Amino acid sequence: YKLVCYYTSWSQYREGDGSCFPDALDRFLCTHIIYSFANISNDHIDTWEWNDVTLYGMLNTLKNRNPNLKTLLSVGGWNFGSQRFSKIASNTQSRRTFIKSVPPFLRTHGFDGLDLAWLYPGRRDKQHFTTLIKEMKAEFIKEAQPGKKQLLLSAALSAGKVTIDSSYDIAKISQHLDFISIMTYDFHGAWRGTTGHHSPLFRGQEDASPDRFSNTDYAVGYMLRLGAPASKLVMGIPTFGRSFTLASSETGVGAPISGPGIPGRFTKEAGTLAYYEICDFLRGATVHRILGQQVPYATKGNQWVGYDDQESVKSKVQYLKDRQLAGAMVWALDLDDFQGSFCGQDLRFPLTNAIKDALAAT
């Protein structure tokens, strides 16, 4: 069972204990650690943060004492701009240049592979995206043909049905990718105007669901159906929750909201709270287990946050194993209690460790 974990380079700037650097990550926690994100300049894979190289080595040093730990560099991201990614992949020269620039850059900085995080292709890129993945793998195979350990190629894919239908040719790309991370969270935007868990396992009360597709179970199964081999499918689990600001005395699923929740003390972004920020939130709050969805939400005052915890991630791992999937993907290591100071127990990476334990269990 693969345990793909994401590290975001921008988590370094978070205030106080919030600040997170690769060297603060547990080398034995995950089987794969992905660095996010690498940029693309002049159609060449390139660093993004001024100190990426330094952090690259900081991350890759973890491989010294643990040879099995695999490492990947993720290119794309949210601030990339699907616009650019489209052109690059669309243009035949740009695509070639970029693909050819990857293997060198990776070996040069100590990475075991590349992770495509094009977020997200459009209806017009469905094929370009296929071509890209196909040719990128070709190159990796070539580059190692002489006898090296072949570079890994993975991709983070949307779990939203609309996007999967318009942008992905699951069957085709599943052949070339070594593994796919299905981003099964962010199912409920604060725009929907009602409270809702952003990462439910199942649909739950058929009566109160907005969508019939906005849940983990559906996405996993849909993808399996579309041709993605279970052995190549990694199910994403979030270590963060989506928040909302309540508009009335109603605090249950589907209650009225006036917008996203108050920003977290360390992540500073409305509608988001890192699990460790949640641990603080829980103090004096009330947790409700959402029957049917297998996930919890907590509410206190005029704040509402849907998230995952030991119990829910355990169920989710249970689910994926029962589905015979490649493993779990975590987003992100810097959002889990990596200090181990917030959720008490002094235990580090409570959610991630919980996931790791469940995977080895039984």
Ligand SMILES: CC(=O)N[C@@H]1[C@@H](O)[C@H](O[C@@H]2O[C@H](CO)[C@@H](O)[C@H](O)[C@H]2NC(C)=O)[C@@H](CO)O[C@@H]1O
């Ligand atoms: C690429 C980008 O927009 N990221 C910003 C960072 O680069 C900023 O960090 C600061 O960047 C300068 C020049 O690259 C460094 O010399 C400086 O040491 C660095 N400061 C810190 C805190 O390490 C960052 C500042 O908030 O904002 C973006 O993340």
Ligand SMILES: *[C@@H]1O[C@H](CO)[C@@H](O[C@@H]2O[C@H](CO)[C@@H](O)[C@H](O)[C@H]2NC(C)=O)[C@H](O)[C@H]1NC(C)=O
């Ligand atoms: C990633 O690469 C892109 C393109 O090479 C960079 O975008 C350029 O940014 C400069 C300054 O912000 C602009 O003058 C150019 O017009 C941009 N190019 C285009 C057309 O996108 C981007 O800054 C890079 N990102 C980082 C942080 O490295």
